[PDB]
Design a protein around this ligand. Structure first.
Ligand SMILES: COCc1cccc(S(=O)(=O)N(CC(C)C)[C@@H](C(=O)NO)C(C)C)c1
Ligand SMILES: [Zn+2]
Length: 500
C-alpha cells in the first residue's frame, strides 16, 4: 500500500523530524527551493546604456535558463514601450559579450544541489565568488550533519524509492532523439539499446530528492528511476511523501527497460545504492586501462597520464564509454603521424584529454589558468593552450555539431593550430592562426564554412579542420571548394608538422 508505506517511513524518521531546529528546516527548504535572483535588483543595478544594450541584444548568440532568465530579464525591461516596438524587436558585439561575461556572475541563483552537481562535490573550485563559495560549504556541511539517520536494516529491502527525470539532464545529445519523431508516445528502440548498453553505474554527488510513492510523469519526464537503498544509506523525511538522500552515493544499474504507463512509453531505470568508492574504483580502473591502450598505440611511455576521467554525476559510466568511442573515431579519421606528433607535444606540456560530467569552469585544466570567473567558459568542449588540454563535457548539448566525436576532432584542430605556430617559432610560441597570412585568409573565406566558424580565426581553423576530416565525403569537398585557401593552408601545416 502506498499510504501505508508512506506512514511507515515517516514514523521511522518521526523523532528525527521533530528534533529539527528552525535553522535545520529552513536549510532543508532552501535546498529544495533554490533562491532565485531578484530581477528587479539586477535591472536597477545597470546603467541605462546597459539597459538599452540588454534591451535589444540577441541573447542566444553566446545555460538555456540563463538565456531564459536574461530574456525574462529583457522582457521585464521591455514592458514599458510600444507594442509595435516589441513586435519589431522580436555573433555578438565584443562590447556585448564582454558585458554578458560580467553579467553572468550576478544572475546565479543560490542552488546547493546545482553547486554540487556542477562541481561534482569539489566545492572549493574557484568558479564562484569566494564568500558565496564559503556559504555553500557551510550549508552543505550542515546538511551532512542533519542527514545522520540511516534507512535501517529493516526497511531497506522492503521499499522502493522513485525519481522522475528529464533525459537531457543525463545527456542532451541523446535526449534530442530518444523520443520517436513520428510518435512522441514511443521510445526509439535504436537509441535505447545503446543507452542501455553503456549504463552500468551512476553517481550522485548532490542530495537526491526521491518520492516514496511513484509520481506520474510530467511533460519531459520520460525517465522513471526505481531505487533500492542500502541498509546504512543516510536519509531524511520531507513533507508530502519524499526522502532526501545523503550526497556522494553510488548506484549500480540493475535493469533498464521500456515500460508502458497510460499508453505512453517511458524508460524505467532500476538501480541499487552501493558505496561510491566501489564505483570510483571501476572508473579509476577504466582510466588506467584506456591510458595503457593509448600509450602503446601512440608510442608513449607506459605510465603516461594523458586521458582523465573527471566523472562525478548520474550518467557516469557513459562518459567513460564515450571516451573510448570518441578516441577511436579520432584515430580513424586523422593520420597517425599527425596524431602522434601533436599528442607528444601536448604531453610535453603535461596536457590531458579530460572527459567529464562536471562543468568546465570547475576543471583544473582551465581554472588554474583562468582566475577571472568572467573569463571562465562552460561549453561542450574546449582547448586550453596554457595547459595543452582538451576538455569535453558529456552532458551538455553542443552548437551545430552532431556527436561528440566531431567535437573532439574540432578541439584537436585547436591543438594542431597551437603546434603549427610553435614549430614556426619555438621561442614566441603563438597560434598559427595569429599569423598574418591566415588572418587575411580568414578575412576572405571566413564566412564560407559553418556559422560558428565565423567567430574568429582560431574557430574558423578548427571548424575547417573538422570538416576536412569528416566521414562524410561531401563535407570534405565543401571545404576544398568553398574555402580553397583555408583548405590548402591546413594541409600545409599538416605536412609541416609531420615532417618535423
Ligand atoms: C555534441 O558536441 C558538440 C560540441 C563538441 C565540442 C565543443 C562544442 S562547443 O562548445 O559548442 N564549441 C563550438 C563547437 C562548434 C566546436 C566550443 C569550441 O569552439 N571549442 O573549441 C565553443 C562554444 C567554445 C560542441
Ligand atoms: Zn573551438
Amino acid at each position: 500500500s502506498r499510504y501505508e508505506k508512506w506512514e511507515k517511513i515517516k514514523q521511522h524518521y518521526q523523532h528525527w523530524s521533530d528534533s529539527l531546529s528552525e535553522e535545520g528546516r529552513g536549510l532543508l527548504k532552501k535546498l529544495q527551493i533554490p533562491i532565485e535572483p531578484k530581477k528587479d535588483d539586477i535591472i536597477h543595478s545597470l546603467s541605462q546604456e546597459e539597459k538599452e544594450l540588454l534591451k535589444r541584444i540577441q541573447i542566444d548568440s553566446s545555460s538555456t535558463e540563463e538565456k531564459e532568465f536574461l530574456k525574462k530579464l529583457q522582457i521585464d525591461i521591455r514592458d514599458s514601450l510600444s507594442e509595435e516596438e516589441k513586435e519589431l524587436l522580436n555573433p555578438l558585439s565584443e562590447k556585448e559579450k564582454e558585458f554578458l561575461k560580467k553579467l553572468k556572475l550576478d544572475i546565479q541563483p543560490y542552488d546547493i544541489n546545482q553547486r554540487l552537481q556542477d562541481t561534482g562535490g569539489l566545492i572549493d573550485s574557484p568558479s564562484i565568488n569566494l564568500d558565496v563559495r564559503k556559504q555553500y560549504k557551510r550549508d552543505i556541511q550542515n546538511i551532512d550533519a542533519l542527514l545522520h539517520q540511516s534507512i535501517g536494516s529493516t526497511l531497506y529491502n522492503k521499499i522502493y524509492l522513485y525519481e522522475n527525470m528529464n533525459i537531457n539532464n543525463l545527456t542532451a545529445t541523446l535526449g534530442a532523439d530518444l523520443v520517436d519523431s513520428t510518435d512522441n508516445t514511443k521510445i526509439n528502440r535504436g537509441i535505447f539499446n545503446e543507452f542501455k548498453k553503456n549504463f552500468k553505474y551512476s553517481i550522485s554527488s548532490n542530495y537526491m530528492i526521491v518520492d516514496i510513492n511513484e509520481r506520474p510523469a510530467l511533460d519531459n519526464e520520460r525517465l522513471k528511476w526505481r531505487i533500492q537503498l542500502s541498509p546504512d544509506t543516510r536519509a531524511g523525511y520531507l513533507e508530502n511523501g519524499k526522502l532526501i538522500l545523503q550526497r556522494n552515493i553510488g548506484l549500480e544499474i540493475k535493469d533498464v527497460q521500456i515500460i508502458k504507463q497510460s499508453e505512453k512509453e517511458y524508460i524505467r531505470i532500476d538501480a541499487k545504492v552501493v558505496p561510491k568508492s566501489k564505483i570510483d574504483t571501476k572508473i579509476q580502473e577504466a582510466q588506467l586501462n584506456i591510458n595503457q591502450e593509448w600509450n602503446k598505440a601512440l608510442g608513449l611511455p607506459k605510465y603516461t597520464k594523458l586521458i582523465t576521467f573527471n566523472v562525478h554525476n548520474r550518467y557516469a559510466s557513459n562518459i567513460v564509454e564515450s571516451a573510448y568511442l570518441i578516441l577511436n573515431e579520432w584515430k580513424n579519421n586523422i593520420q597517425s603521424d599527425l596524431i602522434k606528433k601533436v599528442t607528444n607535444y601536448l604531453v610535453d606540456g603535461n596536457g590531458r584529454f579530460v572527459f567529464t560530467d562536471i562543468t568546465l569552469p570547475n576543471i583544473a585544466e582551465q581554472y588554474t589558468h583562468q582566475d577571472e570567473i568572467y573569463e571562465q567558459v562552460h561549453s561542450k568542449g574546449l582547448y586550453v593552450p596554457e595547459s595543452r588540454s582538451i576538455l569535453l563535457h558529456g552532458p551538455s548539448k553542443g552548437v551545430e555539431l552532431r556527436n561528440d566525436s566531431e567535437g573532439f576532432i574540432h578541439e584537436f584542430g585547436h591543438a594542431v593550430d597551437d603546434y603549427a605556430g610553435y614549430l614556426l617559432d619555438k621561442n614566441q610560441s603563438d597560434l598559427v592562426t595569429n599569423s598574418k597570412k591566415f588572418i587575411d585568409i580568414f578575412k576572405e573565406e571566413g564566412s564560407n564554412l559553418t556559422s560558428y566558424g565565423r567567430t574568429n580565426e582560431a574557430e574558423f581553423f578548427a571548424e575547417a579542420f573538422r570538416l576536412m576530416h569528416s566521414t562524410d565525403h561531401a563535407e570534405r569537398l565543401k571545404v576544398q571548394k568553398n574555402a580553397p585557401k583555408t583548405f590548402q593552408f591546413i594541409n600545409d601545416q599538416i605536412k609541416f608538422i609531420i615532417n618535423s
